[PDB]
Design a protein around this ligand. Structure first.
Ligand SMILES: CC1=C(CC(=O)O)c2cc(F)ccc2/C1=C\c1ccc([S@](C)=O)cc1
Ligand SMILES: CC1=C(CC(=O)O)c2cc(F)ccc2/C1=C\c1ccc([S@](C)=O)cc1
Lengths: 115, 116, 116, 115
């Protein structure tokens, strides 16, 4: 599992559960090809998005549907979504955890890039 | 000045200076039209991107060129950019401060939305 | 104004207003002496805590009463407070902006340290 | 394991490894009694700090030695440490993950309070 997404809710201090995550790879024409997607689990994690075969070097976008998340909770969000865009680079560390911490008017994302 | 962008560098504990910021508005046809752009000043702030008249309702995207920022400091950052996408002025005109704090492998973005 | 505290509310996308802030300086004997205190204003800022003369080298603790803040909004937050502890003015006098972003179960604190 | 600490490095995008964490419980006299401590693992996690028997209701402080961490990496830190102070409350959710994301001049902490 070379790409994992973990999402946390900073309002309720919980995994952000059932958050839609779409992953895109930048095509040669600079458009975003849908690549992988899913909903975060009860631990706010999304595993099995890609394999080490499929996850080649390139620019990827992780799109977290934070707005849907907040709407389901009855809380007014600011952002349309949380968009994480990064170059997956073969060279060094290669397991990516994309950690997102969500608040209605704020989010942070962090990459944990390991071996 | 209804849309301000402020960028802080979490490594240096300083404003993130000369950070390129590009603003887009989603068009009727769902593409991103170029709305405004600028560089953060010495204070890490970007003022004067737009006006009350111009900043109409819509979905805007603020793309903060965090990569060039880190690169020019010799740091190969994780993200290509920090982009904040939001519906603006849905309940009437507001002042938006897009506050972003940058680390090579992390950024956070906060919105300060005030009613003038 | 060498020490400013700014507090943002990440739930409301607003300044965190009337947030009690207490500043302590570690004494020669290692206890926390009360240095200054105040409430964040409408802008979520707290200015005038100290002066260049008073703000001498030392280890300071800024305790942000984030709990009362959330409580008065009907929210039972996780943390009792947000406290930022730092050595100030080690390389000569600096201006410190303690920037804090609050969510009921999370807070972040950033330091903007500038040389006047 | 009712109290876990996870620390991440936002500069290197990695678990924050070998970070000293001290946990304190507020004594009746308002002093902080040392309670539990440890170093974060290679995954930036600190498990086994307490047990569900020992971890009673009360005000706890998690003190993360972020300054030592940054010094070992040759990076000038701002904070002396990251201090997380919270009331452990029996009532509801009761497994605490204290997540800290570290930068030299910034940190955030988040509580993941689960069942
Ligand atoms: C350690 C850690 C984890 C992993 C875990 O909890 O097991 C995590 C997962 C997320 F989805 C989001 C954040 C975190 C986290 C620390 C953290 C990161 C950013 C912020 S922002 C800058 O406020 C705060 C805290
Ligand atoms: C108060 C405040 C300001 C305004 C100012 O200093 O004038 C700001 C500006 C930025 F460009 C970025 C962050 C902040 C901030 C608090 C803060 C926000 C996110 C984080 S992340 C979640 O670690 C931490 C702290």
């Amino acid at each position: 599992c070379p790409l994992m997404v973990k999402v946390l809710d900073a309002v309720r201090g919980s995994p952000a559960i059932n958050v839609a995550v779409h992953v895109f790879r930048k095509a040669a024409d600079d458009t975003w090809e849908p690549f992988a997607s899913g909903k975060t689990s009860e631990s706010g994690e999304l595993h099995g998005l890609t394999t080490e075969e499929e996850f080649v070097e390139g620019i990827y976008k992780v799109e977290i549907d934070t707005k849907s998340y907040w709407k389901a909770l009855g809380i007014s969000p600011f952002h349309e979504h949380a968009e994480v865009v990064f170059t997956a680079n073969d060279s060094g560390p290669r397991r990516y955890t994309i950690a997102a911490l969500l608040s209605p008017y704020s989010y942070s994302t962090t990459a944990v890039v390991t071996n």
